[PDB]
Design a protein around this ligand. Structure first.
Ligand SMILES: O=C(O)CNC(=O)C(=O)O
Ligand SMILES: [Mg+2]
Ligand code: NI
Ligand SMILES: [Zn+2]
Length: 331
């Protein structure tokens, strides 16, 4: 069995290997990359996403989200408070202000320590989930707005044509902006490209050990767990590396820098934080290996998780027994 310790693997495809996306995902899996739940892909030196980032300041962040924490330093939830619209130029200025800027630090490890010690005492503002793309239309390789769609994959594998579309999302981050412990909708893959700015630190639980994280989460968030049998779908719970180690939960960590892709694999729980002002782009995708994970994916039916239009068909076709209850939670 390849990669039996479930380590995060880093790949350096050549320009020729960067042509066929599906084929390279399948290569990474042949080497065991999926066992970790997350892989890093460093593009060939000849590649670029676009010519420059000099003209992005007029993008609008219609609903910036202030991420307010409750709990203790290593075990907390966050809620998202909606703020007034602002442009990317305005947001960048805010991120760099004395109230929000990254503190002085020695290295990534020192910054990680400061994150876990101090995150709860501040409420950073995240421009998340903005439909759109920063890839140039002329970038033909690993362009996140030109991937094969999940609807076409389901049709190819299963023969059923379904409604729905699949487009990318932009994330503008600042120091301490946080992504809570989650898997993707319907336990899909995700791919994330860090276009510019400061790094993003990731933590991940191997898919084969996801239920260990869920069991801890139920213990640590007992009110939430009573409210919903899949409350990590709400994307609000954080657990530090120190707490995971104390409870014996297998995980790994890695820092993504500008110009690098990360791929999350089906049922790979992940969480993390941004080091300072940055912009990432991400999208879900599927492969043939996903189908069995989509059929088994947990679902939130309590009403909180509220998701895209396009998840309807996935539940309807892959999980017909669950469909009626899940849709009640949508309505
Ligand atoms: O970048 C973020 O805030 C969150 N991204 C992801 O969870 C992802 O790409 O799967
Ligand atoms: Mg602009
Ligand atoms: Ni994700
Ligand atoms: Zn729920």
């Amino acid at each position: 069995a390849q990669n039996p310790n479930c380590n995060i693997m880093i790949f350096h495809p050549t320009k020729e290997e960067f042509n066929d996306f599906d084929k390279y995902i399948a290569y990474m899996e042949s080497q065991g990359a999926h066992r970790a739940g997350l892989a890093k892909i460093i593009p060939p030196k000849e590649w670029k996403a676009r010519e420059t980032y000099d003209n992005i300041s007029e993008i609008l962040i219609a609903t910036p989200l202030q991420q307010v924490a409750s709990g203790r330093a290593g075990v907390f939830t966050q809620y998202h408070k909606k703020k007034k619209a602002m442009t990317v130029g305005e947001y960048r200025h805010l991120a760099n202000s004395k109230k929000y800027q990254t503190p002085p630090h020695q290295n990534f490890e020192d910054l990680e320590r400061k994150y876990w010690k101090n995150r709860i005492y501040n409420s950073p503002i995240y421009g998340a989930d903005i439909s759109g793309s920063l890839f140039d239309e002329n970038t033909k390789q690993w362009n996140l707005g030109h991937l094969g769609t999940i609807q076409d994959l389901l049709e190819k594998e299963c023969g059923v044509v379904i409604e729905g579309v699949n487009t990318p999302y932009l994330y503008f981050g600042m120091w301490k902006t946080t992504f809570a412990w989650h898997t993707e909708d319907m336990d899909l893959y995700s791919i994330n490209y860090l276009h510019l700015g400061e790094p993003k630190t990731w933590y991940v639980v191997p898919p084969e050990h996801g239920q260990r994280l869920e069991r801890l989460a139920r213990e640590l968030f007992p009110g939430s767990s009573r409210g919903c049998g899949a409350f990590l779908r709400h994307k609000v719970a954080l657990i530090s590396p120190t707490v995971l180690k104390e409870n014996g939960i297998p995980f790994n960590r890695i820092t993504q820098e500008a110009g690098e892709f990360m791929v999350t694999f089906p049922y790979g729980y992940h969480a993390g934080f941004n080091h300072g002002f940055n912009c990432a782009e991400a999208i879900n995708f599927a492969t043939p290996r996903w189908i069995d994970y989509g059929k088994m994916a947990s679902q939130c039916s309590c009403g909180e998780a509220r998701v895209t239009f396009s998840m309807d068909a996935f539940v309807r076709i892959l999980q017909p027994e669950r469909y009626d209850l899940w849709k009640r939670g949508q309505d």
